[PDB]
Amino acid sequence: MSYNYVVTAQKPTAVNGCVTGHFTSAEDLNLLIAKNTRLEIYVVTAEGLRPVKEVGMYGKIAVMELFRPKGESKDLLFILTAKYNACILEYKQSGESIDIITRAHGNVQDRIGRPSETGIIGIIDPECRMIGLRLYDGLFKVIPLDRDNKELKAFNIRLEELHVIDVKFLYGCQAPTICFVYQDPQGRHVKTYEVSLREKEFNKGPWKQENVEAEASMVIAVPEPFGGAIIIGQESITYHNGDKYLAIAPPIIKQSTIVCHNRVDPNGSRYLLGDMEGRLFMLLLEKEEQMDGTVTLKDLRVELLGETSIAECLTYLDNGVVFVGSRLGDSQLVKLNVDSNEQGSYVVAMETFTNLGPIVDMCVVDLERQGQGQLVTCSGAFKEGSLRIIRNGIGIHEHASIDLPGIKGLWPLRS
Amino acid sequence: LSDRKKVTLGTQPTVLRTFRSLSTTNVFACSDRPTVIYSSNHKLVFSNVNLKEVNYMCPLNSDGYPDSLALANNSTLTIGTIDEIQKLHIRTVPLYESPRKICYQEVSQCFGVLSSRIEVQDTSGGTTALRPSASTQALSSSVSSSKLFSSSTAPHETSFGEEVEVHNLLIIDQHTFEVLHAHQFLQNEYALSLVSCKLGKDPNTYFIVGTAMVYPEEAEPKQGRIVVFQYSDGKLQTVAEKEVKGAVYSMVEFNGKLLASINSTVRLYEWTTEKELRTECNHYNNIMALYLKTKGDFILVGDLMRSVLLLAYKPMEGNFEEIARDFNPNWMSAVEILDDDNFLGAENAFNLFVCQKDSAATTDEERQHLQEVGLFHLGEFVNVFCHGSLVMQNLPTQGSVLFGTVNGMIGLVTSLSESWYNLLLDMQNRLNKVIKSVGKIEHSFWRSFHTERKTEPATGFIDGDLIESFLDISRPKMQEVVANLQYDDGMKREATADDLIKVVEELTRIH
Amino acid sequence: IERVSGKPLLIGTDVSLARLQKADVVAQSRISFPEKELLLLIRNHLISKGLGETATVLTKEADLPMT
Amino acid sequence: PPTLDSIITEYLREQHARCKNPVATCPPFSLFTPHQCPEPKQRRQAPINFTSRLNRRASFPKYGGVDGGCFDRHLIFSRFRPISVFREANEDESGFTCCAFSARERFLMLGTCTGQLKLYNVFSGQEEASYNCHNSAITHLEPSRDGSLLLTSATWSQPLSALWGMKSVFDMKHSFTEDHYVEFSKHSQDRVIGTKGDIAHIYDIQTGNKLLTLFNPDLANNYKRNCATFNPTDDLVLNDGVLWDVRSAQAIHKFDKFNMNISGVFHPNGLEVIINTEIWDLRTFHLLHTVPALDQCRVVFNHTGTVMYGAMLQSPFGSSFRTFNATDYKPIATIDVKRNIFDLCTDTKDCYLAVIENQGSMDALNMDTVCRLYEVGRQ
Incomplete structure (x- = not known):
């Protein structure tokens, strides 16, 4: 029969999801870039990035998120593969021995069901009590986060609503609750629920939001001071906290779809937003100290910040340093200013990272008639389109030509 | 001192030095196989240089090369420095628009890149771009003419400038990589295939661009043309054109004839003397013929939904012929002929498989059915396949197929010998009990062929990236890999440590 | 028609079912607008219909962008 | 009396009523400009053209x-x-009734009017092995996936349905004299269910x-053509349009009758129940949808x-096909087959349609019912 042999020449470079936190130690911020199957563990330093341990896993890392459960100084990491094989990890260091230990695992797949249309969505509860998953288009898998799972137990609480667009956990409101963006057959809206782990069933949700924008795309839950939800759409930005509401449709967010977001400030004071054309925005929030203890929202601002590569990651690190991860080419690390430049951008370019991107065509070609060939790959996408030339070895080609064959040595003389 | 280990360098005495290139204390191996010892993604793995033979080095002080060193040989003296040390040195030529395909001229020194520019439509003027890409900023430009799609009233007027696409043919310089020339096509004309070959006894070497006419709010297109270009003396020229009803998806050269693939129809051409084309034959049993690969006189077709398809060409009969066909509905992504018996294909379900032309042709039904020999979950979407190694031809395995994906993962697929298959596959099942993978995932479970309906366990292929990890395992655990096993040096021997690690290094030098 | 749908309170308007869920949302919407968008229209009316000796007095109450 | 606050509010709301897809928490309005609610301009949706999807899938998942x-x-x-037509050249006119494929897709088990099933190679087009199965005719005929069993049901013969055997020896390995329509169990095939009238029997x-x-x-609908089936989880049975939990032999929920003939079927998602033109839910029991085609x-x-296939059972029978989607039930195609469709079976590997069509006019005295194989997806 036919027998063949498969290796990896270039490790996969395009990134898929980026999570910050404290995964290595107690008091050290770090970055966890998953690309296709690799899980890179950097650390945030005063000069830039510094790798610690790269781990290749068996599967496409689809959903990852850090979480610190009540009882551990350090935190843990949940990773779900493309073949639905879930795991919970923990960094452990002892001298030169640096190891990753799986704390719980177990395949979580139903026998029957259409997978998805919006892909796989996974959200960690803010109080670290459960782990939600949208997997099979009509169910909401709940993994009860406890030490009881030597292998991961699972529930399947039925979503009565079929075509769910995005889903998050809302922040601290004494009970773990869920937000949606659901496409009705006639319209679309935002409904809520409340999971009872002891009864495996949805309780009554506190919000109604009977009609939101016709292309609402994501939910951004705002934290513990003035909790709520921001529903970014194609043409407008809303806010809801049960009673109050704001809405802006600024003329900046008109020409491109917001696709990524992160929480800049820990009290939700700022929010970056990227799009499908390269632009970074910043959704400012005006904190209104209305009463002696009341914290409410007052205004919604959108400030253009400049052009980067087409982002799919978006992570704010520290000291005004933002990491931009690009599937479509040239993931780069950027710096946000205070004042502006000649173009009004605050985005300072720093060191980049080479991505071979979506390769769409190749040709193996030699340009020095040698025994070694070069490979020109059509890399990148819309504005990140670039030919990339790939060679083995070390390219000493800027060399002086001196006719001295078989000489024994050349030694300096100075004054 | 620790244990020793033999590394092959050559047949002459070698030199091992270190120096300061610009900084960071680089280490070099002056040998017949000259390597840089110092780093390979922060790991002690050798990586070569682009020099044939290095004997000595010399710390000079060049006025045009700061802190560089000269290299004494049995040949010339090269004052050179060393950049960031890695295996795969990558150089970026940005174009600021999406590249579609790439070809190569051997006679002329120029590439050929089809590309895609996003433009919005102006009210008074025609259109406008959004950024000064490397399409408009060229040394010369041109425009498509001879409006032969003028009778159709299909281009209706649009309301707003809602991001139409404009494609062109970038011809890029060989050494400077400056864009020499671009050629804008017709309005709403995509370009989907590019080959550059010679057709007939005409001693020119052309460009052939297979184009199609697209319209939104529409199904599959039925318009388009195939245009033959040439680049005589820095000037792109439109020689011929051939309006063809249907989108031209993939082209290959086939024995001095241009083979096409035009909306589930495989149409062979023939270059006449009068700068035109005459259709030689056709094939029709196709859902949507999206791919073509040839070797000699056989033709490999990758269908939209069905599979690998093998199609003959009998030149004495003047037509085609169906040799065989796989029946299992795999959604194709990329195909490539391996060795005129085995055929490799890619799938939307992120998988690989090899089909085989059958041997025991006891009837006509058992020889029109291709057999799937081998299944594997390369968990990554394969776009491209190509021949050609990346290492030096020193004149093992047989052949070398690289592939190009959507995450920048290049890998190598090559053909083994039937003895070393059972050698390595017995090593994997021993290695699948030693290395505890992160996540507690069985390697048999991950590499298993997984469509929407089949979960057959993986066979036929050797996952080399697990076997290359044997080099990192310590000897108190490598000894448990070396069980009571076999070794073929017709003869028979129990397995040992120092020879199984020699096998992997014979594989690691492929890549 | 009233019972199985979004409760029209005995108004004969847009009796079709697709047009009935339109009128529920349009009537229950929260229309708001700033004071500027009216006062600039008030001033541009009063200057237009001759009665102008409150317009320069309306500048005392609010900013006036256009003379 | 009104104020200008109320007048400008009502003026905007009468302009807001022109919004295709209006919103609820609207942005603050602008009296100087028109007001248009944001219509859906689809950017994340794949393009309608196929070549535009083909260029896009090269750099997208x-x-x-x-x-x-869905567009694909x-x-x-x-x-x-149509690739091949399979006649019955023994008495010069075909007499086929029921069609299906084998478990290995090489042969296609047609079924005569006389009560015998005749194998045919899909490549050759040759009679290979006839089998004296039934006296009356063949009504229903399905094999098992492992290729060891075969269920055939007859028209009026005194044993009505027979579990035959197809490994290498052909025998009635179990006999039934009662049921008009037998059916396997889907996932674990160790169960065969069958239904006479309104009574459905579970057999091993x-x-x-x-x-x-x-x-x-107390609960039956008394449909004309009752056919009890299983869900793909092998836990629920649609007898008379009533669900049945097979763990403890209880009824769950009667449905509402509407169409006098058809007792329903399960959709393969395990989420719905498809009664004749009413689409139901399995856990909320709400009428989601109603497809009048x-x-x-x-x-x-x-x-x-x-995908869902549709053949009319209207007197003519099946003047065309009916191609449906399994997710949103949107009609894909109604291809016009000029003859009368009597039965329809498709491949496991999605390449052929087994179509029993009747030649001549609507003649109950002369029936020339042939089998015509189509190819999926070819013009």
Whole structure:
């Protein structure tokens, strides 16, 4: 029969999801870039990035998120593969021995069901009590986060609503609750629920939001001071906290779809937003100290910040340093200013990272008639389109030509 | 001192030095196989240089090369420095628009890149771009003419400038990589295939661009043309054109004839003397013929939904012929002929498989059915396949197929010998009990062929990236890999440590 | 028609079912607008219909962008 | 009296009523400009053209965009082409009744009017092995996936349905004299269910005894053509349009009758129940949908369960086909087959349609019922 042999020449470079936190130690911020199957563990330093341990896993890392459960100084990491094989990890260091230990695992797949249309969505509860998953288009898998799972137990609480667009956990409101963006057959809206782990069933949700924008795309839950939800759409930005509401449709967010977001400030004071054309925005929030203890929202601002590569990651690190991860080419690390430049951008370019991107065509070609060939790959996408030339070895080609064959040595003389 | 280990360098005495290139204390191996010892993604793995033979080095002080060193040989003296040390040195030529395909001229020194520019439509003027890409900023430009799609009233007027696409043919310089020339096509004309070959006894070497006419709010297109270009003396020229009803998806050269693939129809051409084309034959049993690969006189077709398809060409009969066909509905992504018996294909379900032309042709039904020999979950979407190694031809395995994906993962697929298959596959099942993978995932479970309906366990292929990890395992655990096993040096021997690690290094030098 | 749908309170308007869920949302919407968008229209009316000796007095109450 | 606050509010609301897809928490309005609510301009959706999806899937995941595989199924099930027609050249005119494929897709088990099934190679087109199965005719004929069993049911013969054997020895390995329509169990095939009238019997294959007969006299719909089936989780039975939990022999929920003939079927998602033209839920029991093009048609799904096939059972029978989607039930195609469709079976590997069509006019005295194989997805 036919027998063949498969290796990896270039490790996969395009990134898929980026999570910050404290995964290595107690008091050290770090970055966890998953690309296709690799899980890179950097650390945030005063000069830039510094790798610690790269781990290749068996599967496409689809959903990852850090979480610190009540009882551990350090935190843990949940990773779900493309073949639905879930795991919970923990960094452990002892001298030169640096190891990753799986704390719980177990395949979580139903026998029957259409997978998805919006892909796989996974959200960690803010109080670290459960782990939600949208997997099979009509169910909401709940993994009860406890030490009881030597292998991961699972529930399947039925979503009565079929075509769910995005889903998050809302922040601290004494009970773990869920937000949606659901496409009705006639319209679309935002409904809520409340999971009872002891009864495996949805309780009554506190919000109604009977009609939101016709292309609402994501939910951004705002934290513990003035909790709520921001529903970014194609043409407008809303806010809801049960009673109050704001809405802006600024003329900046008109020409491109917001696709990524992160929480800049820990009290939700700022929010970056990227799009499908390269632009970074910043959704400012005006904190209104209305009463002696009341914290409410007052205004919604959108400030253009400049052009980067087409982002799919978006992570704010520290000291005004933002990491931009690009599937479509040239993931780069950027710096946000205070004042502006000649173009009004605050985005300072720093060191980049080479991505071979979506390769769409190749040709193996030699340009020095040698025994070694070069490979020109059509890399990148819309504005990140670039030919990339790939060679083995070390390219000493800027060399002086001196006719001295078989000489024994050349030694300096100075004054 | 620790244990020793033999590394092959050559047949002459070698030199091992270190120096300061610009900084960071680089280490070099002056040998017949000259390597840089110092780093390979922060790991002690050798990586070569682009020099044939290095004997000595010399710390000079060049006025045009700061802190560089000269290299004494049995040949010339090269004052050179060393950049960031890695295996795969990558150089970026940005174009600021999406590249579609790439070809190569051997006679002329120029590439050929089809590309895609996003433009919005102006009210008074025609259109406008959004950024000064490397399409408009060229040394010369041109425009498509001879409006032969003028009778159709299909281009209706649009309301707003809602991001139409404009494609062109970038011809890029060989050494400077400056864009020499671009050629804008017709309005709403995509370009989907590019080959550059010679057709007939005409001693020119052309460009052939297979184009199609697209319209939104529409199904599959039925318009388009195939245009033959040439680049005589820095000037792109439109020689011929051939309006063809249907989108031209993939082209290959086939024995001095241009083979096409035009909306589930495989149409062979023939270059006449009068700068035109005459259709030689056709094939029709196709859902949507999206791919073509040839070797000699056989033709490999990758269908939209069905599979690998093998199609003959009998030149004495003047037509085609169906040799065989796989029946299992795999959604194709990329195909490539391996060795005129085995055929490799890619799938939307992120998988690989090899089909085989059958041997025991006891009837006509058992020889029109291709057999799937081998299944594997390369968990990554394969776009491209190509021949050609990346290492030096020193004149093992047989052949070398690289592939190009959507995450920048290049890998190598090559053909083994039937003895070393059972050698390595017995090593994997021993290695699948030693290395505890992160996540507690069985390697048999991950590499298993997984469509929407089949979960057959993986066979036929050797996952080399697990076997290359044997080099990192310590000897108190490598000894448990070396069980009571076999070794073929017709003869028979129990397995040992120092020879199984020699096998992997014979594989690691492929890549 | 009233019972199985979004409760029209005995108004004969847009009796079709697709047009009935339109009128529920349009009537229950929260229309708001700033004071500027009216006062600039008030001033541009009063200057237009001759009665102008409150317009320069309306500048005392609010900013006036256009003379 | 009103104020200008109320007048400008009502003026905007009468302009807000022109919004296709209006909102609730609207932005602050602008009196100087018109007001248009944001219409859906689809950017994440895959393009309508196929070549535009083909260029996009080269730099984007599996299909190209949101709802990309749906467009790939519109272009690929809206075209069919007849490859081969299988006559019955023994008494010069065909007498076929029922059609199906084998478990290995090489042979296709047609079924005569006389009560015998005749094998035919899909490549050759040759009679290979006839089998004296029934006295009356062949009504229903399905094999098992492992290729060891075969269920055939007859028209009026005194044993009505027979579990034959197809490994290498052909014998009635269990006999039934009662049921008009037998059917396997889907996932674990060790159970065979069958239905006479309104009474449905669960049988084993190993011993053939009555496992559990389920019927509630207080609750039946009394459909004309009752056919009890299983869900793909092998836990629910649609007898008389009533669900049945097979763990403890109880009824769950009667449905509302509407169409006098068809007792329903399960959709392969395990989420719905398809009564004749009413689409139901399995856990909330709410009428989700109503497709009026499903008016009295027998339904056949793909093996993946991604498309629904439709053949009219209206007197003529089946003047065309009916190609449906399994997710949103949007009609893909109605290809016009000029003859009368009597039966319809499809491949496991999605390449052929077994179509029993009747030649001549609507003649109950002379029936020339041939089998015509189509090819999926070819013009």
